[PDB]
């Protein structure tokens, strides 16, 4: 599934990172991970569970949560 | 303009955390970096120029290189 992680407004590639170091360190089932300045206050995560990524995020300072529901990937390249 | 960088098949999301931090860092002009499971051996990162790309991978581990011209974002969805 894709997750939509609300971030701070300029703090997506700062929290992009940390969740790529936190996913390989904690061996979370993340997949991928996209941040852009095109898309402001958001980190796209693939992930298999939302579980996943609630454990992804724990504790990330600038980070506010994940959007409800899932991310269909057709809204992701408008959006860029 | 979006670049493709190659790395060893499996280090995308490693890589791709390296770089996010190696990029607000330096303040490398990097805008966007995408890594995927479902994209074996690339990095995509979107940047100013390809200095910035180059100065962002330089002395990685695991990181092959930078692959000869741009990305066309069409050929980025198809791949996922």
């Given at each position: 599934?894709?997750?939509?992680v ?25 997949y ?49």
């Amino acid at each position: 599934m894709i997750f939509a992680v609300r971030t701070m407004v300029g703090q997506e590639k700062n929290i992009a990172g940390l969740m790529a170091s936190r996913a390989e360190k904690e061996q979370l089932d993340v997949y991928s991970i996209l941040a852009s300045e095109s898309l402001k206050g958001y980190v796209l995560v693939e992930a298999e569970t939302k579980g996943d990524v609630e454990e992804l995020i724990k504790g990330m300072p600038r980070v506010r949560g994940i959007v409800p529901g899932t991310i269909a990937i057709e809204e992701i390249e408008p959006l860029l």
